[PDB]
Design a binder for this molecule. Sequence first.
Ligand SMILES: O=P(O)(O)O[C@@H]1[C@H](O)[C@H](O)[C@@H](OP(=O)(O)O)[C@H](OP(=O)(O)O)[C@H]1O
Length: 1565
Amino acid sequence: LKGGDVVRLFHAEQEKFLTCDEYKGKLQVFLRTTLRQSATSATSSNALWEVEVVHHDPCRGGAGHWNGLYRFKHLATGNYLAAEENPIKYCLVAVPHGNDIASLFELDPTTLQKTDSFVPRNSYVRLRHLCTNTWIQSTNVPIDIEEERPIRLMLGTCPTKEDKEAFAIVSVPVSEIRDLDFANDASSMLASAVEKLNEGFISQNDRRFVIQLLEDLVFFVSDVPNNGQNVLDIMVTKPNRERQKLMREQNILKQVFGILKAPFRPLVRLEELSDQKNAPYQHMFRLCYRVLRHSQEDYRKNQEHIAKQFGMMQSQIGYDILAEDTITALLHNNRKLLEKHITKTEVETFVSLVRKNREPRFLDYLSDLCVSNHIAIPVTQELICKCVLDPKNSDILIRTELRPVEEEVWLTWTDKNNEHHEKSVRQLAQEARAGNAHDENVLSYYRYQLKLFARMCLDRQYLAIDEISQQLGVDLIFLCMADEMLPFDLRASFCHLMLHVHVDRDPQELVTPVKFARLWTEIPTAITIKDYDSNLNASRDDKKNKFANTMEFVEDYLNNVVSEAVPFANEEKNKLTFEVVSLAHNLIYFGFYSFSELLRLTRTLLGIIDCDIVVMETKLKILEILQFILNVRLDYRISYLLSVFKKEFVEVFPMNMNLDRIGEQAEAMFGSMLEVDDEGGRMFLRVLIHLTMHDYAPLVSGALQLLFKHFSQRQEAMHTFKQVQLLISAQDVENYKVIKSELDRLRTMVEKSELWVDSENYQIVKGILERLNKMCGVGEQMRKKQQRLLKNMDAHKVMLDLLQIPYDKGDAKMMEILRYTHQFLQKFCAGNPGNQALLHKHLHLFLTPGLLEAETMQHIFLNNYQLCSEISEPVLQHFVHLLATHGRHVQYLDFLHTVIKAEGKYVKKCQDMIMTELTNAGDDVVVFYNDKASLAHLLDMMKAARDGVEDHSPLMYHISLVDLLAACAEGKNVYTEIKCTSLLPLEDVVSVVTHEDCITEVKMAYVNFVNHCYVDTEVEMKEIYTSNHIWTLFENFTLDMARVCSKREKRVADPTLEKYVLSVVLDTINAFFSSPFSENSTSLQTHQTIVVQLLQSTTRLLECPWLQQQHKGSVEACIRTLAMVAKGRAILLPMDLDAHISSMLSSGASWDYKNIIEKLQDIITALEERLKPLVQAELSVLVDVLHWPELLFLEGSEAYQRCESGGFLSKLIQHTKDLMESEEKLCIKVLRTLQQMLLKKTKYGDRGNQLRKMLLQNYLQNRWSAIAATQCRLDKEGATKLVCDLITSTKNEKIFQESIGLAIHLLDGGNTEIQKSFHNLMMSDKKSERFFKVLHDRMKRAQQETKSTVAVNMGTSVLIMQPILRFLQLLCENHNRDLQNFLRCQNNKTNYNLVCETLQFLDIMCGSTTGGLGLLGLYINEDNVGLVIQTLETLTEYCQGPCHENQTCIVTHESNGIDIITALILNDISPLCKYRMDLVLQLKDNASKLLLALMESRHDSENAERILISLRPQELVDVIKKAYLQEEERENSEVSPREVGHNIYILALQLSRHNKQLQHLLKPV
Ligand SMILES: O=P(O)(O)O[C@@H]1[C@H](O)[C@H](O)[C@@H](OP(=O)(O)O)[C@H](OP(=O)(O)O)[C@H]1O
């Protein structure tokens, strides 16, 4: 560290960054809080700090020493950090000048330092203020409490020193400093311009200088080298988020806003902008607006800062300032901001201005405003509709008509002069071809008006769809789109309108291609494609009656496109083909096209996309179409197999099956006619491979998904069949029919939401919901059957849409309908994890600020440990934020209570997050009555509710809060137990308990609190056993038991009181008396009478006949513990009561539905068994295709060259890297496929081999060494870099595991090229530290978990070790000295010793000191024997070569792993050898190998004596002799005890050179 260098100070405990900012006009220093998930990423320019050194010469900075005074300066404000009297005694603030001792500071090192050596950068230090001799500290008191959710935190000083107040230094790149300085200069120039504007006098040259400033700022913001384009029209491909944030914090946006506002405040006027005098001012406003547009691109914070000014841009609209385009961009960026900004006056202004200009371009602004992210916004849509469809704006809308004149289309428009002109469309198009400017202008205006109508009608806006449909008929639209004279763009507009108005309408409904649940009677005996399509042919024809000719047009147009030599030669036709393909996709998904027609169309589509944003989108849509056709084919296959099953069942049982006969037809089905393409699959697969190469990410993802699915047809169909459901019983058939009808009606009503929202529709929907509630049924098994039926029906999506329906809080009828819907969802999710998964998929909608949907979410999360594991901190945060904002009722707490527990299992992480959030929120969310006055208020409410407690009472809210807190206490969790102890004192608990009259439920809650937070403490609490709160609680408990018994004697008793006692009091008493901590209680001699009375109360409780049998047994166990405690606590029992206690001790010592189902299940199982090998046979074909993609493409093509160069594989690897974060499943699939490619070839049996031969012959034309060649090819293509990047950056366990597996497979065989590539990557790359740190951290976590399980008595952390150790062994295989030395010393800034980590792992696994003592038999079991063997092999690989440094490290490590290594040989491993002796022999052999490798080539004796110290020669000789004799008892196995003994003998011979006794013993008779 040197003076004049800028760095950042970071707090470890607080995980926050110090900063200085002008909160309310005054500069203040604070520890800003960050809501990000990565503290290191919370870096701001204003948080930069500079270090200044104090020297004798004021101009001399030099380099700071550990004993030199230091000062902290702000790189932006320039003020210096200092401490001043706090109105904590001193508070940190910023001063303008450093000419005072206050700014002086010193850095106390946290660790040892090299005397007065220069301070190293990025070293922990503690700030100390020498001016007043006070130590800096951190506090949670905010400085900006005035604002909700404060971020600024106070940093005071303490007279004493605290070791936790350590600040870490972080370096800063020169780029940040340069950007900050340039931004400051630009801000100064902008301030000068603002001063000129405020003065109202500015020279022409000065204004030109301002324009030049704006141009330079435009260049800087664009970040694109200037190419001569206008700054106003500058184009930026991607903005820089850091630069935008720098501008925002510098307030350059504020400067621009002031520059725009001040002239109109005048120096300039909006009307006067037309004047040449104010033309340069208008140009400067335009520059400001373009700069704002570039600044706010893709930045929500900048968008919010602009929204703060939304008023001024709204006023600026209607003037030549590009406000329209800027506002449209900003509004399209975010939908919520659009909902805030949009207003009816703004819509009217847009209509008025577009009318004023009579230009097409205005309409585009409204068109873009209508939709965002291509997703419609109902409010803006309706607002635009209301203004557009009004007759007043009929002038702007060009009316069109069809007249015979066989038919012709005419257009009438109105000019600004009000003159009306009407012309034929065909004549207008011909005049356009001629080139008339007016005709072109009217055509463009017409096109933009149709585009605006289409965007208005987007997402089924029936409020305005009707009028537009009436104005433009289907026949008119088809005539227009069929007309050839019309330009391609206008035809495309007509096609888009046709798609978005008529085709997408109520009569049409999205059809799910695959139906899981079918009826047995429905199944046809004989099935063909025609029979399959006959199921809904009548409905298809009925719907076709309206749009029949359009399908003919689309089919013919696609035939023409495929016939065309070059598909995408012309862009004007590219637009039209995009529109036509989109229309085809919508028609297909609406189901107009039959299965045979879809198969016919697949050929044309694949030809079109078989050998530009529009082209890429067209290809993507065609891929989606193909996916739909393939899934329809899957459904057809399922139906055919079901038909075969029906035929066989009918034959056998008219009222022994030929399973082989069924299986033959099943195999034949998979295989002909079903094939999408004529070639037989080659066309499709080639299309997919070619698409994978293209740049577009969604296109590549879809191509890869289709390619993977194409080679897994059989397994998917088998899964679908196993999930098929059959209806055979009349009751369930009737239920299915009723559900279908009700769902159809409900879907229609939801679709016409717009019409029936505000009627009879309300009552109809309420009746439908009641019928559904009755339909859901009762009975657990009946419930699961009905849930399966409902999931098959797919009504969940309909109900989710019903919830999505918009509404106003005033509609109580719609509230009741929502309650019915929530009950329906509850019944769907009632004890069904499968259904709950579907709900979690769409949970994003469920996250709303409402009690009823919160309860529904609770019921969704009920009993799902998978969902608890995958829970999200942001979701929990938003829940606690809901509590903080409102905290109205207990349902919020009940949700958290449900989340806490799952399957009677504890998740420590969620509990910790809940406790932390509760503490951070503080008294606002947590309300406690600890204070006497608050307890008095609680007493008042308790007395009011003494007769009864209301279901929404604040008393019950407090009780629920207490229960929630105790639930977090469950689990003997020390970390949260400390917080609970801080939260609530036993003295408050005793006060409230000892109150004369208390609520029974409150008492249960507090006893539960005691049971969890205090009794179940992991760490002994001294206050518990040094305090009398527990004895006061026990006397109260005994009084309560006496009350319960007297009540039952009186025949009048309170179930709440009885439940309180039985449940909480008994458990607390038993836990206390069985507590190991309480075994040393020394006040029991004083409370002898109290404890004896408690035991008497328990005796009476057991004597009571009313006590339940389960309660009786639990009480008997508790009383056994009570007596065991009572033996020696200075308590003498009465004679009769002692006899009764002895009796207690004695007691403690004392057509066929089911036939059809079974037949189907047996057939499914037989088919699965038969087709098991063919699945792998098909899968292997994908590996062969990936190995040889070029054979697919005709030789001599450009694709052939690219494939031969390995381009396809490299693109696959790079795309895997790019998509690891977005499509984790596809990333994992690609990684596993790469592993399969690397793996050795394996035979698949006779049938599998035949299938593979046929598949390869059809797909391809015909055109350890192999493993090494494949490994080298993958390394060249970039597999090594992909693996390194994944291992460094992935946060997914599956991704990490697959990456490590790919590494192991690549390195298999000790490939020197792969090892050298890994070494080069690690050494050259800057992420070597990240890679090694990830591996070392995983190893350390596994070691910690291993210690935990050893203490307890096998964990993903341990299981992940095997691949990591294998990877390290393979890296060091073949005695690679470079790698072996690198692992020990990476020579990086932080060096992690993987060798010592492995040795420590072995030590902890074997038991460390106890293992050395010789408890290896107990410590090692069958499960971990493989891991121990792998660790020993890895250590041997490290040692061999020989690596002298590694050998010395292992022998001299402080863990004494050598002791365990030798103990392994000597110890018998008795528990294991009895059952699995071969593993013990292998362990001993590996240990001997490691010991020999340790002294491979060490001439010195140091290692020999170190080994001999633990390994006495006599034991070694006895082991060798024992092994030789045990040879005879050998059983069949690869390991040989004679070989093990020979290796041990060789080790003994090597050791004997330094030991005379060993030599003498080894000498034979
Ligand atoms: O990823 P998102 O949705 O944008 O949210 C980010 C983050 O969650 C915070 O809102 C904010 O950090 P602070 O809380 O530290 O302000 C940050 O802005 P920033 O770049 O101004 O920090 C955001 O970008």
